[PDB]
Design a protein around this motif. Structure first.
Motif, PDB file in Angstrom:
ATOM      1  N   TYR B  18       0.831  -1.187   0.000  1.00 55.20           N
ATOM      2  CA  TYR B  18       0.000   0.000   0.000  1.00 55.20           C
ATOM      3  C   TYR B  18       0.872   1.246   0.000  1.00 55.20           C
ATOM      4  O   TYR B  18       2.014   1.234   0.465  1.00 55.20           O
ATOM      5  N   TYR B  23      -5.370   4.648   3.056  1.00 57.20           N
ATOM      6  CA  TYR B  23      -5.980   4.420   4.360  1.00 57.20           C
ATOM      7  C   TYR B  23      -6.003   2.941   4.713  1.00 57.20           C
ATOM      8  O   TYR B  23      -5.992   2.587   5.896  1.00 57.20           O
ATOM      9  N   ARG B  24      -5.992   2.067   3.706  1.00 59.15           N
ATOM     10  CA  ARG B  24      -6.160   0.629   3.880  1.00 59.15           C
ATOM     11  C   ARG B  24      -5.003  -0.045   4.601  1.00 59.15           C
ATOM     12  O   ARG B  24      -5.075  -1.254   4.815  1.00 59.15           O
ATOM     13  N   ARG B  25      -3.951   0.682   4.987  1.00 58.73           N
ATOM     14  CA  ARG B  25      -2.963   0.149   5.910  1.00 58.73           C
ATOM     15  C   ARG B  25      -3.516  -0.019   7.317  1.00 58.73           C
ATOM     16  O   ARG B  25      -2.930  -0.768   8.108  1.00 58.73           O
ATOM     17  N   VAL B  26      -4.641   0.633   7.634  1.00 53.87           N
ATOM     18  CA  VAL B  26      -5.218   0.572   8.972  1.00 53.87           C
ATOM     19  C   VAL B  26      -5.718  -0.830   9.315  1.00 53.87           C
ATOM     20  O   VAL B  26      -5.874  -1.159  10.496  1.00 53.87           O
ATOM     21  N   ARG B  27      -5.927  -1.691   8.315  1.00 56.71           N
ATOM     22  CA  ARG B  27      -6.294  -3.071   8.590  1.00 56.71           C
ATOM     23  C   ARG B  27      -5.143  -3.867   9.185  1.00 56.71           C
ATOM     24  O   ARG B  27      -5.387  -4.918   9.780  1.00 56.71           O
ATOM     25  N   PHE B  28      -3.901  -3.400   9.052  1.00 60.86           N
ATOM     26  CA  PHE B  28      -2.784  -4.118   9.642  1.00 60.86           C
ATOM     27  C   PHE B  28      -2.357  -3.528  10.972  1.00 60.86           C
ATOM     28  O   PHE B  28      -1.406  -4.019  11.578  1.00 60.86           O
ATOM     29  N   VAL B  29      -3.040  -2.486  11.431  1.00 61.83           N
ATOM     30  CA  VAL B  29      -2.697  -1.820  12.679  1.00 61.83           C
ATOM     31  C   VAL B  29      -3.102  -2.707  13.850  1.00 61.83           C
ATOM     32  O   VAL B  29      -4.271  -3.075  13.997  1.00 61.83           O
ATOM     33  N   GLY B  30      -2.125  -3.067  14.684  1.00 60.16           N
ATOM     34  CA  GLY B  30      -2.331  -4.025  15.748  1.00 60.16           C
ATOM     35  C   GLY B  30      -2.380  -5.464  15.292  1.00 60.16           C
ATOM     36  O   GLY B  30      -2.591  -6.357  16.120  1.00 60.16           O
ATOM     37  N   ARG B  31      -2.200  -5.710  14.001  1.00 59.17           N
ATOM     38  CA  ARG B  31      -2.295  -7.035  13.406  1.00 59.17           C
ATOM     39  C   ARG B  31      -1.086  -7.133  12.481  1.00 59.17           C
ATOM     40  O   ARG B  31      -0.114  -6.378  12.600  1.00 59.17           O
ATOM     41  N   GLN B  32      -1.095  -8.095  11.572  1.00 60.67           N
ATOM     42  CA  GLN B  32       0.045  -8.288  10.697  1.00 60.67           C
ATOM     43  C   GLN B  32      -0.401  -8.426   9.248  1.00 60.67           C
ATOM     44  O   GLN B  32      -1.528  -8.835   8.959  1.00 60.67           O
ATOM     45  N   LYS B  33       0.496  -8.049   8.340  1.00 64.25           N
ATOM     46  CA  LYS B  33       0.329  -8.300   6.916  1.00 64.25           C
ATOM     47  C   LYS B  33       0.963  -9.642   6.598  1.00 64.25           C
ATOM     48  O   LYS B  33       2.188  -9.785   6.645  1.00 64.25           O
ATOM     49  N   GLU B  34       0.138 -10.624   6.279  1.00 60.83           N
ATOM     50  CA  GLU B  34       0.643 -11.964   6.024  1.00 60.83           C
ATOM     51  C   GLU B  34       1.229 -12.011   4.623  1.00 60.83           C
ATOM     52  O   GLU B  34       0.519 -11.831   3.634  1.00 60.83           O
ATOM     53  N   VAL B  35       2.538 -12.213   4.549  1.00 63.71           N
ATOM     54  CA  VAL B  35       3.238 -12.416   3.291  1.00 63.71           C
ATOM     55  C   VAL B  35       3.912 -13.776   3.363  1.00 63.71           C
ATOM     56  O   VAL B  35       4.204 -14.292   4.447  1.00 63.71           O
TER      57      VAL B  35
ATOM     58  N   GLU H 152      -1.322 -15.139  -0.517  1.00 64.18           N
ATOM     59  CA  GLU H 152      -0.291 -15.255   0.509  1.00 64.18           C
ATOM     60  C   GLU H 152      -0.701 -16.242   1.591  1.00 64.18           C
ATOM     61  O   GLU H 152       0.110 -17.061   2.034  1.00 64.18           O
TER      62      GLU H 152
ATOM     63  N   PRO K  72      -2.565 -10.826  17.729  1.00 65.09           N
ATOM     64  CA  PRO K  72      -1.960  -9.896  16.761  1.00 65.09           C
ATOM     65  C   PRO K  72      -1.256 -10.568  15.587  1.00 65.09           C
ATOM     66  O   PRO K  72      -0.830  -9.858  14.668  1.00 65.09           O
TER      67      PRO K  72
END
Ligand SMILES: CCCCCCCCCCCCCCCCCC(=O)OC[C@H](COP(=O)([O-])OCC(O)COP(=O)([O-])OC[C@@H](COC(=O)CCCCCCCCCCCCCCCCC)OC(=O)CCCCCCCCCCCCCCCCC)OC(=O)CCCCCCCCCCCCCCCCC
Ligand SMILES: CCCCCCCCCCCCCCCCCC(=O)OC[C@H](COP(=O)([O-])OCC[N+](C)(C)C)OC(=O)CCCCCCCCCCCCCCCCC
Ligand SMILES: CCCCCCCCCCCCCCCCCC(=O)OC[C@H](COP(=O)([O-])OCC[N+](C)(C)C)OC(=O)CCCCCCCCCCCCCCCCC
Ligand SMILES: CCCCCCCCCCCCCCCCCC(=O)OC[C@H](COP(=O)(O)OCCN)OC(=O)CCCCCCCCCCCCCCCCC
Ligand SMILES: NC(=O)C1=CN([C@@H]2O[C@H](COP(=O)(O)OP(=O)(O)OC[C@H]3O[C@@H](n4cnc5c(N)ncnc54)[C@H](OP(=O)(O)O)[C@@H]3O)[C@@H](O)[C@H]2O)C=CC1
Ligand SMILES: CCCCCCCCCCCCCC(=O)SCCNC(=O)CCNC(=O)[C@@H](O)C(C)(C)COP(=O)(O)O
Ligand code: SF4
Ligand code: SF4
Ligand code: SF4
Ligand SMILES: [Zn+2]
Lengths: 31, 95, 55, 114, 208, 156, 380, 176, 297, 41, 96
Positions: B18, B23-35, H152, K72
């Protein structure tokens, strides 16, 4: 070839009838 | 072969990250971006080129019926290797 | 199968049937979870001749 | 051009059936507001009934208005008998739906729909 | 053509053709077509004024005795001016046979209800009212049977869309389940699957 | 502090009681209900977890939505949810309850019961196995176990 | 005046007009599981339409698979191979055991006998293990397909079906010990829901709903499909048309299903399990990855699907709830133009109003039990 | 070819009438039913100890989806869209392009697990065994969007479960 | 304007409204209906919550998938506030308590936390900030509530100069503490004049204040259409409800008259028709049932 | 007689349940579809 | 194992008390079973991975993770594709 098959003589006999085995004393004996 | 944007977000093997002002980075706030960190484009480049003595080679991807449909690759170009269109394994005529 | 013969006899008497001959819990009599590989046959159209599809 | 009727031979019998259906809905609206314990008034429900009747006021085919009377009687039967819940009665009042842009300019502002 | 091809039953084909001739000549007032398919099913295509006389015949005639109504069906074919094809599937237990009785209507012509012939029809044509909009005259209690109570439209019409026009959700402001115009997060993806090559030359329509 | 320890132990006590005495009301809508019946069947036997078989809706603790939620039944689902006393939980079981499933693009199907009720556990499958439903119920018990009601009450 | 009770939301809405204890009118409101299945079928291929049939009568999955497969194979003018037909009859009778366990035990559970439910659902769990071993799914197998079945039996499955079938008659015997001679079970079923033979024929009843009334009709006997003319079994016939004779017919159909399963295990032939027309059934994966024609046919069958010749069939089977029919209309394309699903429970629940007249309110749950009603097939 | 359930006329001699009167007054079949329930009281129950014991499954089992790789790390999926064509739920959404070495690979491989009907038509349509429906069934979530798997997630499921998926395919591919 | 925040759709649940809202205090009475009206447009709604996540469950059906992001926050933690606001284009403040607690007095809830949210939203580049004061907020007020809320209004105005400050009078609704307070009190009648405003009117006013670029830097006063004396209002509440927890600060606020501020814009200047009480008092007070309308001034 | 004479234009728009926005703002296109030039069929 | 137990009881796991930093003394989880033992425990095979080990791959996870939902570390979905339409960027120089 190898396939899911019954055995050579086939399977054994499978019961399928009612078997309510008729237990208890006679009505004369229970009084 | 994962890398990182200046936002701190990991870039996927597609190249998705992103923007900073998205704004769509807010879905990873407090969570993780699974790659997935096993990039297939880097792992198939690690495989060595198979030197064969034939003009046409066949590839099924290994495992026979557990691989891909068997294709035939021409090796007449000496400038370029012959790459399997399914599995990416590449071949060279040794002459 | 692990029932004692007193409980087994009480149980067979209460049901009126021989319950150990036909247990509803399965034991070593069932098939193995790892099987040999199959070799499945092919159908009648797996022929190299006299096998035109219009027929 | 010779078709088989449903109930009405012409438009006068059809208007008679429309008129009786409107009478029955007009009588039913206060009971509907009461037993469904609706938050609307009797005047508002009767205005909605008048709106639903005037929406179909352009029809000149006797078979089509016969089917409209049949479907209105079905809706009335689902209302008198408590087969609808409160949600089905209040679906005539599109209350959670935001008002659509009506003029050209607001439809131009919000999107592509004509 | 032995192993993979379905075997043809010529005896049942001949018997159903003879019985179709029988029905067509006993009832020429209403019978329009009689056909027997290649898998041996008999179809009697009738005029809609003869719903009651044909079905009462097949129910009560000693050589028919089609006592069971297996199924009652409409089919929407929008290219016909009588777009709805009402299909009766009947079972004779006496002669171990099935027959299909087909008729037609448009949106506005009522079909006579066959509850006086088969009481089984009571819900089926009621379903045909709910799904297709075909009105059945002299039905005992004709109303919707499958759709929601305030449902607008008839869903099995082919111009009715797959997702409808409205969808429900709980709204907490009004404390109520509400109906709104349908928005899909993912549109249904229409697949154009038909090959442009002819599959069955036996079913080729004659050109213009 | 002393009161923080007391409200922590009381949270642990009430969370223990609520997760070890979960009483479900099962909406037996469709095929998933059958699999719920296998989670009550003697192999899995929900009753040994404290999860009773077929509690009445006015004394139940979790609503298991097991099946396709159509438009004609969604107000009845919401009414039974509104009649459940707190704390109430909702397990969504199977693809149609989760997101519409095989009938997602239908005119008559609610696209997931989360449009109607708040959902705590989504159990995926078509149907999920009875063991997968039991997994979801134990995950709901773990979710109840880490609730912090009295700690947040003491901190507010 | 008389009392009106709205028994709200399987799931069913009932509108009762009672006159005290007696039932004057029973109006079942349905559509609570109407999902528009057979409109969804029109936008999918024949293979894609197959898993909708698992979900109609969702305690009789492979039977509805078999009925849809027979309809498509009739329109395709092809026949399944013999081993596929024997597998279909084997799993159709396993399916019949599943459905009659569900029927009898929930019908006893709704009356108050809760224990044989738990006794018979372990046997039902073992038959779901049979489904899972043959297809990968415990319930919706998607296994019986047009052309045959999807995959051959795994090795050792028939031995385990034998070990199940050898013991299942004792389970039927102890169910029948709990219910059949029990005077409380007889008081709830013997004078309840009496249907005459003429009304059962006229109201479109099928299956046990006919056979409880003495009608000697079974589609596996009269209009036989895959290899049911090669298996030997009896048809249980009732004498009084009540809930109790229909109960006894379902118990004896479990007996006869065990008989058919023994005959299917002994007479299972070798050979292929799909039709060897690769324009209908997909080729094997080893030849798909080797042969050009097989890869093309795999591609086209899994993307376009097979074209079905134009025409309409009504194909019916003796499902465990009764006559399960498909009126399938093909336009020539690879997608069904129309697929009307005839379910037995639809006409049975329509006949509920006649069957409940003159009975009590507690008798209505017994009549809804003796009509084996699953609302997935009722509502589609 | 048919039999009559419940067409027995009871005997009307004093022996059988007294037998039925003794059954009526002395509750004989009720004691029979109590005996059968008492018989199951002394049986070992069928209850397995979940989660420590597990229900038995086959290698054909259709559980959680995964995208697989070749034994070189190269992913098997060559973006042919057969799985999304055959998908009866339209649960699969695929976008593709040539990547930097010209290989035909996906940029989007989404499976909505809440649309998915878990029927496995994708794994049997897959020409290269890329998409599989693996053995995991214990993947319940607390939120709906955690069941909307992108590429992913599916590749991580493949890398997570490949040691089991490859052995299940090894046990079953000769039936396929 | 970034491409992901361009509005799309027809304004329904699956649409994109282009509103990325962080609603502090969304788990309360106003936040319920604000997250409802935002989520039905298809807005991205960030809900920072202090409470048990169970107590946020009712916010979850209000929008499409991924359209409500829940995250923990603390009022005395600027890092959590920055974590909640840094992706939003509007921040709404609905943090309030009718009573002061052991950990939070009126100065914490009405001065410290709103100034912290407004300052962190200013230094995060948030375009729009909406703050909710009370109509009767005054420095010289008799109640500590209204004094601290006037001080917090002043500090929000001076640290976010383009903030939209909104003055509701007395909000009534199903979960209010105005009509439900009067219906469960079973305190007296004085010369207090009130014009209570309906909650959906307040919510429509807030969302029209989001969409109006002219609402930046303004101070709105959301009042009902009809001013009532307190006595006949309370008698109307006992008449509709079919009848024959408190503190002295709440008593001072019930006996505080709703002031008239004609110089401030209202609901009509945001395109909202103020719903009268007599159309909605039955919808509130139907719960309290085991009518001649009130006289206006 | 048992048949009536309706000379009006056939219009079923009030019976189909379609909302008005998807009647009067839609443009139906009636056409024989062009051949896919990827194929000769 | 205990092959004298009936089928279903004959194989079991006693879970660890600590896995991946989480105390699992009381919070045992069915997803704690690694995939090489998941065949054996669910009876997909007769052979444990001590006897028949799984085939080693460089991409198979060395560290199995349990169900991470509610943590998390949980999965958050996102579109994996890039931006489709490129917008015109106006020039940063004035136009006079
Ligand atoms: C009557 C009163 C109870 C008498 C004891 C009893 O019935 O023991 C069961 C014992 C064994 O019964 P079974 O069902 O055949 O055993 C099958 C087991 O699988 C065979 O048992 P197992 O192989 O599973 O052995 C392990 C088992 C061993 O089982 C025991 O130790 C049984 C408990 C004995 C006390 O130990 C446990 O599982 C631990 C049990 C701990 C809790 C015991 C609670 C006792 C209740 C009072 C407090 O019953 C008998 O031997 C017949 C009845 C004897 C009556 C004696 C006169 C009174
Ligand atoms: C006879 C057998 C049973 C005996 C009784 C049961 C034994 C244990 C009794 C005490 C249990 C703990 C208190 C009651 C349960 C409270 C649960 C709960 O939701 O608490 C949050 C509630 C409310 O907390 P809240 O203010 O966060 O509320 C959140 C709810 N909304 C958002 C809707 C407002 O806490 C209390 O009510 C506190 C009560 C006192 C706490 C204990 C004091 C010491 C007792 C010794
Ligand atoms: C301390 C222990 C106390 C309890 C002991 C028993 C425990 C076990 C009980 C298990 C069963 C529990 C079932 C619950 C429901 C019971 C239903 C039931 O049985 O209903 C009652 C049933 C009802 O029967 P029915 O109505 O189903 O049968 C049909 C009857 N006709 C045809 C007439 C309509 O039986 C009775 O009413 C019998 C009552 C008790 C009689 C006791 C015996 C008396 C014998 C006297 C001597 C006779 C000799 C011959 C004549 C000459 C005389 C000189
Ligand atoms: C100042 C300090 C004190 C403050 C006030 C507190 C007073 C004492 C209250 C009881 C004790 C408090 C702690 C409660 C348990 C907390 C720990 C816990 O939950 O442990 C979990 C453990 C089981 O682990 P679990 O996660 O359930 O395992 C999954 C299944 N394999 O659980 C177990 O092993 C069982 C837990 C049992 C809980 C205690 C027993 C019940 C409570 C008795 C007293 C209260 C009720 C009084 C009488 C009521 C009517 C009978
Ligand atoms: N009559 C009315 O309702 C009127 C209200 N207002 C103002 O409007 C605003 C919203 O009102 P309303 O919804 O009714 O109030 P509520 O009491 O119902 O809700 C207030 C919200 O603020 C949160 N909150 C309260 N204290 C704190 C704290 N110390 N730290 C973090 N969060 C906190 C609450 O969260 P949690 O649930 O966790 O406690 C809740 O979400 C308030 O500022 C109020 O003063 C103005 C005029 C009239
Ligand atoms: C609470 C909500 C309840 C909602 C109730 C919904 C009921 C809907 C029923 C709909 C029935 C109809 O619309 S039938 C009307 C169609 N009639 C026609 O097209 C003929 C024209 N009719 C008219 O103009 C009618 O006003 C009259 C009264 C028949 C004649 O008036 P004109 O003369 O001047
Ligand atoms: S998720 Fe599947 S199996 Fe479950 S109820 Fe829905 S259709 Fe039936
Ligand atoms: S299992 Fe079936 S529904 Fe699920 S993704 Fe594969 S093809 Fe689609
Ligand atoms: S079928 Fe297989 S190779 Fe083709 S797009 Fe799907 S996963 Fe990829
Ligand atoms: Zn290759």
């Amino acid at each position: 070839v190898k396939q899911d098959m019954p055995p050579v003589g086939g399977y054994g006999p499978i019961d399928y009838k009612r078997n309510l085995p008729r237990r208890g004393l006679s009505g004369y004996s229970m009084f | 072969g994962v890398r990182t944007s200046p936002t701190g977000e990991k870039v996927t093997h597609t190249g998705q990250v992103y923007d900073d002002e998205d704004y769509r980075r807010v879905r990873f706030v407090g969570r993780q971006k699974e790659v997935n960190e096993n990039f297939a484009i880097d792992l198939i480049a690690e495989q060595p080129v198979s030197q064969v003595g034939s003009r046409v080679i066949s590839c099924d991807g290994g495992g026979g019926a557990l691989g891909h449909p068997r294709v035939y690759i021409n090796l007449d170009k000496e400038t370029k290797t012959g790459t399997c269109g399914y599995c990416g394994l590449q071949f060279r005529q040794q002459h | 199968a692990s029932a004692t013969r007193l409980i087994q006899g009480l149980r067979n008497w209460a049901s009126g049937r021989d319950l150990q001959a036909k247990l509803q819990l399965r034991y070593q009599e069932i098939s193995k979870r790892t099987q040999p590989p199959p070799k499945l046959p092919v159908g009648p159209s797996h022929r190299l001749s006299n096998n035109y599809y219009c027929a | 051009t010779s078709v088989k009727p449903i109930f009405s031979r012409d438009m006068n019998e059809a208007k008679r059936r429309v008129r009786e259906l409107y009478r029955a809905w007009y009588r039913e609206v206060p009971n509907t507001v009461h037993l469904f314990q609706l938050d609307i008034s009797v005047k508002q429900g009767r205005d909605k009934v008048r709106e639903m009747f005037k929406k179909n006021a352009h029809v000149t085919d006797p078979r089509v208005v016969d089917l409209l009377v049949i479907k209105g009687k079905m809706e009335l039967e689902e209302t008198i008998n408590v087969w609808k819940q409160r949600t089905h009665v209040m679906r005539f009042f599109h209350e959670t739906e935001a008002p659509r842009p009506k003029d050209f300019l607001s439809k131009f502002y919000v999107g592509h729909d004509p | 053509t032995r192993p993979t091809v379905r075997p043809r039953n010529d005896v049942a084909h001949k018997q159903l053709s003879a019985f179709g001739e029988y029905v067509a000549e006993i009832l020429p007032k209403y019978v329009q077509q009689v056909q027997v398919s290649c898998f041996s099913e008999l179809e009697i295509c009738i005029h809609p004024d003869g719903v009651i006389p044909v079905l009462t015949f097949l129910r009560d005639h000693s050589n028919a005795q089609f006592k069971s109504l297996a199924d009652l069906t409409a089919v929407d074919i929008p290219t016909r001016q009588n777009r709805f094809e009402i299909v009766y599937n009947l079972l004779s237990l006496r002669f171990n046979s099935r027959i299909r009785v087909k008729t037609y209507t448009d949106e506005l012509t009522p079909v006579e209800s066959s509850v006086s012939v088969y009481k089984a029809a009571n819900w089926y044509e009621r379903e045909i009212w709910d799904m297709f909009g075909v009105f059945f005259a002299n039905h005992p209690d004709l109303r919707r049977i499958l759709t929601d109570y305030g449902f607008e439209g008839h869903p099995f019409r082919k111009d009715f869309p797959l997702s409808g026009y409205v969808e429900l959700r709980y709204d907490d402001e009004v404390k109520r389940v509400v109906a709104e115009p349908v928005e899909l997060a993912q549109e249904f993806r229409k697949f154009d699957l038909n090959s442009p090559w002819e599959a069955f030359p036996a079913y080729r329509q004659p050109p213009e | 502090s002393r009161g923080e320890y007391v409200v922590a132990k009381l949270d642990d006590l009430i969370n223990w009681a609520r997760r070890s005495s979960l009483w479900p009301m099962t909406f037996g809508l469709a095929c998933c209900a059958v699999e719920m019946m296998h989670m009550a069947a003697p192999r899995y036997d929900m009753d040994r977890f404290g999860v009773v078989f077929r509690a009445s809706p006015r004394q139940s603790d979790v609503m298991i939505v097991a099946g396709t939620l159509t438009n004609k039944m969604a107000p009845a689902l919401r009414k039974v949810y509104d009649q459940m006393p707190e704390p109430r939980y909702v397990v969504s079981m199977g693809s149609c309850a989760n997101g519409g499933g095989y009938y997602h693009y239908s005119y008559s199907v609610v696209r997931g019961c989360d449009r109607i009720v708040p959902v705590d556990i989504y159990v995926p499958g078509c149907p999920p196995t009875a063991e997968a439903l039991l997994y979801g119920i134990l995950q709901l018990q773990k979710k109840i176990k880490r609730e912090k009601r009295l700690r947040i009450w003491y901190r507010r | 005046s008389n009392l009106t009770l709205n028994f709200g939301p399987g799931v069913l809405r009932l509108v009762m007009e009672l006159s005290g204890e007696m039932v004057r009118k029973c109006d079942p409101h349905i559509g609570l599981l109407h999902r528009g299945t057979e409109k969804l079928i029109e936008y999918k291929t024949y293979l894609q339409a197959l898993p909708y049939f698992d979900r109609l009568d969702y305690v009789s999955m492979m039977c509805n698979e078999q009925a849809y497969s027979l309809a498509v194979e009739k329109l395709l003018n092809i026949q399944p191979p013999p081993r596929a037909q024997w597998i279909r009859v084997l799993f159709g009778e396993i399916t019949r055991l599943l459905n009659h366990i569900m029927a009898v035990t929930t019908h006893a559970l709704d009356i108050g006998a809760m224990t044989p439910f738990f006794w018979m659902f372990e046997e039902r769990e073992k038959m779901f293990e049979f489904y899972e071993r043959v297809s990968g799914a415990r319930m919706h197998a998607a296994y019986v397909r047009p052309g045959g079945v999807h995959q051959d039996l795994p090795l050792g499955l028939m031995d385990d079906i034998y070990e199940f079938s050898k013991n299942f008659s004792l389970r039927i015997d102890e169910l029948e010990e709990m219910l059949t001679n029990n005077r409380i079970w007889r008081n709830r079923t013997v004078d309840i829901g009496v249907v005459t033979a003429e009304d059962a024929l006229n109201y479109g009843f099928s299956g046990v709903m006919l056979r409880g009334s003495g009608i000697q009709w079974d589609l596996r006997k009269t209009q036989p499909y895959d290899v049911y003319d090669q298996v030997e079994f009896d048809v249980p016939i009732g004498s009084r048309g009540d809930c109790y004779d229909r109960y006894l017919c379902r118990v004896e159909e479990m007996r006869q299903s065990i008989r058919i399963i023994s005959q299917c295990l002994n007479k299972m032939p070798p050979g292929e399990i799909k039709v060897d027309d690769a324009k209908v059934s997909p080729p094997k994966r080893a030849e798909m990855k080797t042969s050009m024609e097989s890869l093309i046919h795999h591609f086209k069958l899994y993307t376009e699907g097979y074209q079905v010749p134009p025409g309409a069939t009504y194909t019916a089977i003796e499902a465990p709830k009764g006559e399960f029919g498909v009126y399938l209309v093909s336009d020539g394309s690879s997608r069904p133009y129309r697929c009307k699903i005839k379910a037995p429970g639809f006409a049975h629940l329509a006949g509920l109003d006649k069957m409940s007249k003159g009975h009590m309110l507690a008798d209505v749950v017994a009549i809804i039990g003796t009509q084996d009603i699953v609302f997935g097939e009722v509502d589609r | 070819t048919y039999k009559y359930v419940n067409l027995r006329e009871p005997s009307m001699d004093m022996k059988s009438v007294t037998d039925r009167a003794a059954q009526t007054l002395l509750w004989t079949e009720l004691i029979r039913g109590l005996g059968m329930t008492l018989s199951y009281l002394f049986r070992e129950p069928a209850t397995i100890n979940y989660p420590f014991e597990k229900g038995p499954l086959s290698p054909r089992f259709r559980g959680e989806h995964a995208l697989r790789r070749y034994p070189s790390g190269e992913e098997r999926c060559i973006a042919c869209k057969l799985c999304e064509a055959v998908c009866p739920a339209q649960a699969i959404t695929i976008e593709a392009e040539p990547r930097a070495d010209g290989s035909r690979r996906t940029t989007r491989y989404d499976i909505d697990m809440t649309k998915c009907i878990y029927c496995g038509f994708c794994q049997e349509a897959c020409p290269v065994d890329a998409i599989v429906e693996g053995p995991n069934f214990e993947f319940s979530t607390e939120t709906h969007e955690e069941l909307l798997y992108n590429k992913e997630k599916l590749l991580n499921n493949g890398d997570k479960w490949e040691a089991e998926i490859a052995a299940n395919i090894q046990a079953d591919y000769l039936y396929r | 304007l970034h491409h992901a925040v361009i509005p799309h759709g027809k304004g329904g649940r699956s649409s994109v409204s282009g509103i990325v809202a962080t609603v502090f205090g969304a788990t309360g009475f106003l936040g319920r209906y604000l997250v409802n009206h935002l989520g039905r447009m298809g807005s991205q709604v960030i809900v920072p919550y202090r409470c048990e996540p169970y107590d946020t469950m009712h916010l979850r059906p209000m929008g499409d998938l991924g359209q409500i992001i829940f995250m923990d926050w603390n009022g005395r933690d600027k890092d959590s506030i920055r974590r909640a606001v840094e992706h939003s284009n509007v921040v709404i403040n609905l943090v309030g308590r009718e009573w002061e607690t052991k950990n939070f007095d009126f100065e914490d809830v009405f001065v410290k936390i709103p100034q912290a949210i407004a300052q962190v939203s200013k230094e995060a580049g948030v375009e729009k900030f909406i703050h909710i004061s009370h109509l009767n907020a005054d420095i010289k007020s008799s109640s500590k509530y209204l004094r601290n809320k006037a001080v917090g209004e002043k500090e929000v105005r001076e640290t976010f100069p383009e903030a939209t400050i909104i003055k509701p009078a007395d909000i009534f609704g199903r979960e209010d503490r105005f009509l439900n307070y009067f219906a469960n009190i079973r305190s007296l009648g004085k010369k207090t004049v009130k014009q209570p405003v309906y909650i959906v009117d307040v919510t429509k006013g807030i969302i029209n204040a989001i969409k109006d670029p002219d609402a930046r830097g303004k101070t709105f006063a959301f009042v009902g259409p009809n001013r009532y004396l307190l006595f006949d209002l309370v008698q109307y509440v006992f008449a509709v409800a079919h009848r024959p927890w408190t503190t002295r600060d709440k008593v001072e606020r019930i006996h505080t008259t709703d002031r008239t501020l004609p110089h401030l814009p209202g609901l009509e200047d945001l395109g909202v028709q103020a719903t009268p009480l007599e159309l909605k008092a039955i919808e509130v007070l139907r719960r309290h049932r085991t009518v001649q309308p009130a006289k206006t001034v | 007689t048992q048949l009536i004479t309706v000379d009006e234009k056939l219009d079923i728009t009030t019976l189909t349940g379609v909302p008005e926005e998807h009647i009067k703002t839609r443009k139906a296109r009636i056409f024989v579809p062009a051949r896919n030039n990827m194929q000769s069929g | 194992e205990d092959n004298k137990q009936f089928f279903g009881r004959h194989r079991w796991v006693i879970y660890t008390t600590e896995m991946n930093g989480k105390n699992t003394f009381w919070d045992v989880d069915g997803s704690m079973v690694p995939p090489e033992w998941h065949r054996w425990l669910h009876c997909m095979t007769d052979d444990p991975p001590t006897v028949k080990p799984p085939t080693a791959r460089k991409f198979i996870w060395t560290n199995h993770k349990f169900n991470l939902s509610g943590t998390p570390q949980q999965y958050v979905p996102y579109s994996t594709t890039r931006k489709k339409i490129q917008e015109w960027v106006p020039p940063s120089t004035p136009y006079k």
